[PDB]
Amino acid sequence: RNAFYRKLQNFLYNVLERPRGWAFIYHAYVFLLVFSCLVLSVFSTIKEYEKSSEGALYILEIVTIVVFGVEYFVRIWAAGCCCRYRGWRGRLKFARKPFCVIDIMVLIASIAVSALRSLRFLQILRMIRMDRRGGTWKLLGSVVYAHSKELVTAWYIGFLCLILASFLVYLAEKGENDHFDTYADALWWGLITLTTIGYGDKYPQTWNGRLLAATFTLIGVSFFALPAGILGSGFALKVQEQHRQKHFEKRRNPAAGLIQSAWRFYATNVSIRAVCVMRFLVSKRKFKESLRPYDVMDVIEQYSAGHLDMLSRIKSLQSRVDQIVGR
Amino acid sequence: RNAFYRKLQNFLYNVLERPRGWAFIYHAYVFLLVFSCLVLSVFSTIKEYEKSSEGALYILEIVTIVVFGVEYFVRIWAAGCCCRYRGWRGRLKFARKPFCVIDIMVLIASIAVSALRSLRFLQILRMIRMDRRGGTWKLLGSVVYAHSKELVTAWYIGFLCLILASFLVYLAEKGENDHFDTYADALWWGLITLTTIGYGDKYPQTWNGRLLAATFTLIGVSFFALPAGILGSGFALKVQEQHRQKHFEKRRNPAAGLIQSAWRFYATNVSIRAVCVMRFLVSKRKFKESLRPYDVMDVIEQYSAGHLDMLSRIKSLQSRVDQIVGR
Amino acid sequence: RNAFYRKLQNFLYNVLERPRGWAFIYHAYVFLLVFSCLVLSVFSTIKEYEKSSEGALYILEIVTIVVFGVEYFVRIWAAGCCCRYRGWRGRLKFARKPFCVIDIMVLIASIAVSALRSLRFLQILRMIRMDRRGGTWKLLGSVVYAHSKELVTAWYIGFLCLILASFLVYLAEKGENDHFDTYADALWWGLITLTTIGYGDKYPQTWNGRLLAATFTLIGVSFFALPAGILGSGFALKVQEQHRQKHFEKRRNPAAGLIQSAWRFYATNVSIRAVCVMRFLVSKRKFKESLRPYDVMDVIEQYSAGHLDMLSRIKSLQSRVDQIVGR
Amino acid sequence: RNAFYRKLQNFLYNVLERPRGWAFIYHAYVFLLVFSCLVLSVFSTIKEYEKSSEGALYILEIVTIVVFGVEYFVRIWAAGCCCRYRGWRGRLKFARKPFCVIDIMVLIASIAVSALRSLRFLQILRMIRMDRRGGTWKLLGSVVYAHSKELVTAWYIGFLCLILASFLVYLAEKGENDHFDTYADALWWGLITLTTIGYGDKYPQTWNGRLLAATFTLIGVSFFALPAGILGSGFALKVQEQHRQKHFEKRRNPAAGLIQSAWRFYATNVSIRAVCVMRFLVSKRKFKESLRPYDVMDVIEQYSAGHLDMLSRIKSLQSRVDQIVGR
Amino acid sequence: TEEQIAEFKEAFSLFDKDGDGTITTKELGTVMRSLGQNPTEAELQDMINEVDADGNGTIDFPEFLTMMARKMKDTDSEEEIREAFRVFDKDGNGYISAAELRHVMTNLGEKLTDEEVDEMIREADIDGDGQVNYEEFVQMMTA
Amino acid sequence: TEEQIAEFKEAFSLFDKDGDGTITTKELGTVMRSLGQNPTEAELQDMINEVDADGNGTIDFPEFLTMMARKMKDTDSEEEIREAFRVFDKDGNGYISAAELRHVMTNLGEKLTDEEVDEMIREADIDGDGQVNYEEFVQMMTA
Amino acid sequence: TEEQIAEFKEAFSLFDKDGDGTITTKELGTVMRSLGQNPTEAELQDMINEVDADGNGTIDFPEFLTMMARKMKDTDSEEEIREAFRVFDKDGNGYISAAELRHVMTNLGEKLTDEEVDEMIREADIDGDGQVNYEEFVQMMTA
Amino acid sequence: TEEQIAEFKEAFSLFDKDGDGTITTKELGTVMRSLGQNPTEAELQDMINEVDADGNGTIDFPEFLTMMARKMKDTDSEEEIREAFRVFDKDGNGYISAAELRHVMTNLGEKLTDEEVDEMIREADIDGDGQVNYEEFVQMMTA
């Protein structure tokens, strides 16, 4: 029953590795399971709830270790679906994946288990391992890079405003207020107020201080809130762009051309061969040039191609009418 | 006077059920009326204002019950406009609607009236019933789903930043600060500061704590503010899209084709019948394919159709000029 | 020198009334002048700075009254530029403008001057009068109306979250925390925390309270921040739309047609008259149909017109080639 | 080896002046270096850490002065690449640049070094000099100017809401609350609450105060958060526009025409000359009209040109078919 | 049944002029022209894709027979026509006047002769109120 | 009046060549060509929709008479022409020079002969200041 | 080698009809037509830019020889074809059926005769599982 | 001067074939065709708007004389050509090689004969470094 064996291996690889549908339910389940361990550890930190929290946490962590071990074994087994990871050589190369070795370290350390500090560190490490593909980090980095200049503008001007406001309020409040006795305390106040956190541990009391704080909050608060707004709008616009580009989806014909071209090139193994290789180059360029823009540039280019085509047809018709005139 | 009876029934159904214009005035009136009951209950909770608040609340709640009863009865009566709910059978099926039964439960419990806790719970339940169509929930869910990946990125990285910053500040302030005596207190501080709530009950005091808090606020505050910005931009972009799509509105001809096709299909009750059913299929596909994109994809498709059609015409003219050449 | 008189009257009307360039400098000057009076009044409220603040405020307010009087007189005089306001009748009708009578009331009350309370009220009234055109209110109302459904969704769900979180935390903290002794105090805490104001006067202390506060802040804070983000994105998108629409500016030819049509209609004062009036109707419809869309709908309509026209030309060429075939 | 000399001079000018790639690494290095001096100064302000902070800061500042001096000298030397700054005259004119003279003042004052106050002022001055091109300020000013009307609407209405809410809460809390004893204190509270800073030093306590504070926070918080959202969305939209416009890049042919036109004009030194100068004018107009729109206006104009062209061709074909009819 | 199979085979033979049990676009177009209607390339390809469940561009006899086997109720178009008429239900009350119905049927979408609309009103004016219902209409259509 | 009704009927008869009291697009186009101007399909359909208050594409005599009955003031176009001129009031002061007025009237929108603009200035140069007003202008035309 | 150089020169001479060691677009088009294929202006210019590393629009013999010198592995197209087939790997499991493979080969992009696809399956059905792999496929292709 | 005025009048007479002191689009096009170049409607109208400071579409002799009076420096095009060449200054260093300069001049924008580029390099290769500067270039042209 090797057919059903392979089918099940494929299904398990689909679930454990990139899921699309209700395998997200399993992934969220294992998440919630580790998150529950984290929360129970947090409660175990408290002395009053130490006993019950520890009692539940022992079993919850043992279940976590069992599930992580079984999942890791099933993952390494189901990696066989991809031909890259076949046999012992291929599967060991699969274990070379950074997240696989990280997961192995997780299991080893957990079975081995500053004990509480180490437990907290390893909980954080499990959580970061949760991603396992880098999608979130890649997306965030992409959007940040896209808006690098605006983010840097916000950072620079907001930092300047923070420094200036903190120094001015320090000058106005150095003596009359216990809070701003050193420039560092004034900087702490400025950072905590421009972020709108406002702990209230420090705040100006002299009229100079309150006036300057008002006129500099009315600037710094907006500057510190900017990056969040910039990134949010960038994310929303990117979502809209992905939604639009999902429609036209013009990656098909270039791919067919490229694959048929490679097949012919292998079949080609002097002028006919020159034509074969040149058309293979043409197919490759079509593939990449379809890959590159993937946006309204294609639409504008299609408009231009249609326009020039119709002008050429116009010239042909003019030539025909002229020839009829001559005839 | 059954004609005026039906006209008034239709008007009342339009008002009570989906309104468009100044029936929103009545809906806002009944809202304000229940909201006033809620506020008066809140004031009744206070001992000092217990007497006057209770005195007003008795009459306000009795008026609420009267208006809700009359509105429910008028709604069940006016549901007759829709043929689906006709006669006792149809109107009883209408009462099967979840919000109708919820409203009945509201009336029964109110007339029946942990008394204060129950009153608060039922006020909340009335408020949730206020929607009665799920429009707000559906819209919010749609926009959240559209940006699911970005929201998950923000959630994941912001949660990681919260955990890391809380642990680092706890380490830096475990002994020297009374606030961070347990990891749970440090996590409370981290959550309250990254949200920019900043109660001020906890805040770092050691230089390690303040430094780490600064460098991790300058990240966590933006991450926690992101989801709001992402959703706001998504909502605004969706509004702009609805405004644009409101113009072209190309659902007319496909619908006319579909209804005429169904009429013919009924009239059709061998090759003529095959043509009739096949063209009915054509009409159905036209209807759905008009339904699906409802966006700029329609414009691009129209561009493609125009381009290919004009190219075909060009070929026709080329053939004609060639034939003239031959002649 | 009536020509220079009229030229100067026009220039002053342009400055005082709708300005475009460096008349904004004068408007900002008079603003700053009234704002300085407001700030000096604020300082006069303080006992310690009462003397100096009052001393400066006397002269600053007298200067304010002088400038407001001269500006009002110059405005009523320069309203003569518009032929609507000519002679005593026209200028009196101009004085009928709500902001003109508001300015008259301001001047009368100021010369007449709960004295401090009245002064504060009149300062607020001057500030609101500052607009004098309703532009800010109209713009804000327009953008709010555009996103009415999204704003209502945010309001509704955020209010529900506030009520639910406040009640749950009240239940969890009714006894163990001095802050939440009445439901009203819990609601105050919920409103102050979900807005991210976080006064810190109230905050949960029991583990139930802190847990529920965390899970409900992670929702309410975003919901309360939504409206700001929605409106900000709406404003930015509207700005982008205005920038785009500023280019094509297709209001010229319809207006020329309409004015020439009205001139002809006056000149027309039976079949010729029928054509004249009917073409006047055509011109009016062209004017309005140019007014209405003012967006990409025009562009799509132009595309459609070009398409259908070229298809008609194609039909003409097909007919010609067919006739040649016959010949 | 003047060739390698010039090559190295060009590379150094590229690095020090406008960089594109990994020269940003050097710029970030010198930034971090000055930022470290700032932080060490902040720590030197504290008495407890005065000794170690001063000890490190001496050497760090000396290194800063050395690096700034060498960088300034290398910059003045490498400015020779641009022909504008050649020889002593050109390089001295280069030193006329505002940032070059600012940098010279920086070195002079540092070597010369209210000593601590002067040091803080000069640290701020170095930081502002960091930009050296005004890019951040220009970008921020551009985006603010684009949304000037929306920002002014937010400012105006939010300021009115602040004034009104502060006065109302002052009235409601003048006697019963120690915080609001003067209108200035109430205004301080209003500014600190509508910004969502919420120090908690002042907050309403009477039921009037809490009610009014609730209903006015639910407005002022959004108004004060608006400008951040507006600017963030503006920045994101501008980024999207730059990304789109980066594609077509149509500035090539107009520039080629303009330069060839100028060459011909110089060569031209009567009807032939008239043609030369008129075509030079044509080239100049093409260049500028290409510079101006740089947006979708180009696409719409191209559509219009293609349309009118094809209609003219249609007329030509109609004339030809008519002539054939006659023949 | 046997008569249905024989008549379907005769209709197919009139359709697939090639005689190889494969109705192509050209033969469908020719039979359509014989019937009078003029099908375009888009119409023909949409038609074939609608009937072609294999993807070869031609239909075999069992495919045609099974597509014909679908009845009014088996089509499950009740919801589709319901929403379509709702789109045509301008007021949304659940009814539409005779004049508006005639206008939309004759002059929008596919133009169709007045005899067909007269027949539809004849077989649909159960109550003859002018504002004739469409919900029970489509219910009896599917039945 | 009776004379107005008779002249309107004569004009309609010259319009509706069919003689069935239904002015169609073709007859309107032919009469317009006889008048000299060339109306396009878009112009013809916009016109017919402007006059056709029923939707059948043809106009009966009472409809033509009632649309003709509208006077200058009854049209309530004062606001429309006022705002149009404001659009043409470049400065916005309430006046426009003779040269700019002539240019905009002759060379923008619909091209019209110089005699018409000469007549308009003759009947409108109440003050003859060059920068002739348009507000009182439109008031007097509407009256 | 010497034989390779001579055969390349003969092919070029058949290409550059001008005989000046500069293959132009017109000569490429003529030889393409002789071969049967019809190259368009876009195809011709894309090809010339692909081969023209100088920018003069014509190719000299050493350029032709050096572009021909590239082998299957030297092209470094393994990644390109890998991702292309992945795009054609609908499921993403790493395999594709014979029917879908033939459909994409002969009915999408550039239509290719059935003989070529038959030959590819003949030389590629190492296991003959229908769901034939493409990774080892392309590995052997590049080798 | 007097000779300049007379020669300008002769050139205008060759331009305005009408003889009424009003150079129209048709006459400009005819003289352009005589010169060899073919001006399009867009080019003709752009030119006329460039010269027509009144807006009547035709130019009188004083207008032609005053536009011709402009010299190289009076044009104030130094900044325009400076920025244009900067656009053509790919590296931005302030210099451009001879090969790239020739390519951009001959093959982009307006195609111009090789004699003109040879003459420009002859009159511009002050240093003959290949990477010839453009700043002093434009300074010397403007002078």
Ligand SMILES: Nc1cc2c3c(cccc3c1NC(=O)c1ccc(F)cc1)CC2
């Ligand atoms: N919000 C915000 C404000 C300011 C910052 C300053 C310096 C550095 C970072 C930030 C800073 N942090 C981000 O913008 C951010 C967001 C998301 C992310 F992933 C990384 C950084 C001065 C003012």
Ligand SMILES: Nc1cc2c3c(cccc3c1NC(=O)c1ccc(F)cc1)CC2
């Ligand atoms: N804002 C915000 C930040 C963070 C969150 C984290 C985990 C879960 C939710 C949120 C979280 N909540 C929403 O984003 C949200 C908004 C609207 C809505 F309807 C539901 C959830 C970590 C950081």
Ligand SMILES: Nc1cc2c3c(cccc3c1NC(=O)c1ccc(F)cc1)CC2
């Ligand atoms: N922000 C914000 C949140 C919430 C609100 C709720 C009820 C009413 C208003 C708001 C409310 N206020 C606005 O959205 C707003 C903004 C601008 C403006 F002009 C008017 C209202 C529940 C949660």
Ligand SMILES: Nc1cc2c3c(cccc3c1NC(=O)c1ccc(F)cc1)CC2
């Ligand atoms: N946020 C914010 C709110 C309010 C303001 C008021 C008056 C003046 C400025 C602001 C004000 N400041 C900015 O909007 C801003 C942002 C960025 C920048 F560069 C300059 C100003 C009333 C309410």
